[PDB]
Design goal:
Pdz3 Domain, cell membrane, monomer, phosphatidylinositol-4,5-bisphosphate binding, about 190 residues, 12 strands, alpha+beta, elongated, membrane
């Protein structure tokens, strides 16, 4: 999680898409969905990002519809956005034990207990937090098994990006859980 505000320049694809669904949260606008192989993924937009501005207009107090409407009517050549990096999220670095454990239990993406004497306990991992990213890879909508897999095949350092459940459940309401599994960019960034 970067310590503040950056500008991205976006370009609609040939079909006039950018790859983005946005959600109104506490009078800001937040990234609910980044589509894989979209202009939004290429420029590095992330789940939970805050959009401060769209072409120099502040988003404060916009509806999800107005934000989507503004994106439709943009002069597609060049959309600029002002972005605050995943402000509802934190990153925890843990190290696996020789048994390959970081030392917690999760269910539908949500940490539910921390195991005594673990790297998770030592690093103050919290329950009632949804897993957003593992090693900078988005994992929202993946099955618990596939998250297990990404943890199993991770190296010994595991970086987890988490979000309080109440905030997570506010962001993903009105997005059917198959679109999350199917269409949320789950890939490693390109260079």
């Amino acid at each position: 999680i970067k310590q503040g505000i950056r500008e991205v320049i976006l370009c609609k694809d040939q079909d006039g898409k950018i790859g983005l669904r946005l959600k109104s949260i506490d009078n800001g606008i937040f990234v609910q969905l980044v589509q894989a192989n979209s202009p939004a993924s290429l420029v590095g937009l992330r789940f939970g990002d805050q959009v401060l501005q769209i072409n120099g207009e502040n988003c404060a107090g916009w509806s999800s519809d107005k934000a989507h409407k503004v994106l439709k009517q943009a002069f597609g050549e060049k959309i600029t956005m002002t972005i605050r990096d995943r402000p509802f999220e934190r990153t925890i670095t843990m190290h696996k034990d020789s048994t390959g454990h970081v030392g917690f239990i999760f269910k539908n993406g949500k940490i539910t207990s921390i195991v005594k004497d673990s790297s998770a306990a030592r690093n103050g991992l919290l329950t009632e937090h949804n897993i957003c990213e593992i090693n900078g890879q988005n994992v929202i909508g993946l099955k618990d098994s596939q998250i297990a897999d990404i943890l199993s095949t991770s190296g010994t350092v595991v970086t987890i990006t988490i979000m309080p459940a109440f905030i997570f459940e506010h962001i993903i309401k009105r997005m059917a859980p198959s679109i999350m599994k199917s269409l949320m960019d789950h890939t490693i960034p390109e260079v």
